[PDB]
Design a binder for this molecule. Structure first.
Ligand SMILES: Cc1cc(OCCCc2c(C(=O)O)[nH]c3cc(Cl)ccc23)cc(C)c1Cl
Length: 149
């Protein structure tokens, strides 16, 4: 995906590590288009883990994530849930927020090494399945606008 992929991997990766563990990545992060996306994501996102906790918990249970090898096998189930039907920014937040929910879990069991791979995985599925649509919304820029004020 090049630019779209590089940008999405940064937003999602930082958001997931931010979610499990505190704290920002101080490194400046080819655009402030990314900073604006992280913040929109940070605010619209924290609700979702709240509201869907039971369901999220159930899904994680089925998944059985213990190690890095398990994270590498999640793509098919991840595409399965994501690509059915209608696309919107809200569905994307849900893909990303679960990813953050899964990421928190990864930390608890001291597998924080797995988070980067989880992010790569999520970004692959997002850009592969929804690429054309995303380009149409202008990508991350379209995202911040859709949720603005
Ligand atoms: C990181 C990650 C994200 C995923 O998101 C799939 C699409 C979002 C979604 C949707 C959805 O967009 O229809 N419904 C969900 C329900 C639960 Cl319990 C969890 C996620 C969703 C799905 C999986 C399996 C994984 Cl591992």
């Amino acid at each position: 995906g090049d630019e779209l992929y590089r940008q999405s991997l940064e937003i999602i990766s930082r958001y997931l590590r931010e979610q499990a563990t505190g704290a920002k990545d101080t490194k400046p992060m080819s655009g402030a288009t990314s900073r604006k996306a992280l913040e929109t994501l940070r605010r619209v996102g924290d609700g979702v883990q709240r509201n869907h906790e039971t369901a999220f918990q159930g899904m994680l249970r089925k998944l059985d994530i213990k190690n890095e090898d398990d994270v590498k096998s999640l793509s098919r189930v991840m595409i399965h849930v994501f690509s059915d039907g209608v696309t919107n920014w809200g569905r994307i937040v849900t893909l990303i927020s679960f990813g953050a929910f899964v990421a928190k879990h990864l930390k608890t069991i001291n597998q924080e090494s797995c988070i980067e791979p989880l992010a790569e995985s999520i970004t692959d599925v997002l850009v592969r399945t929804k690429r054309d649509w995303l380009v149409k919304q202008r990508g991350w820029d379209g995202f911040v606008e859709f949720f603005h004020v």
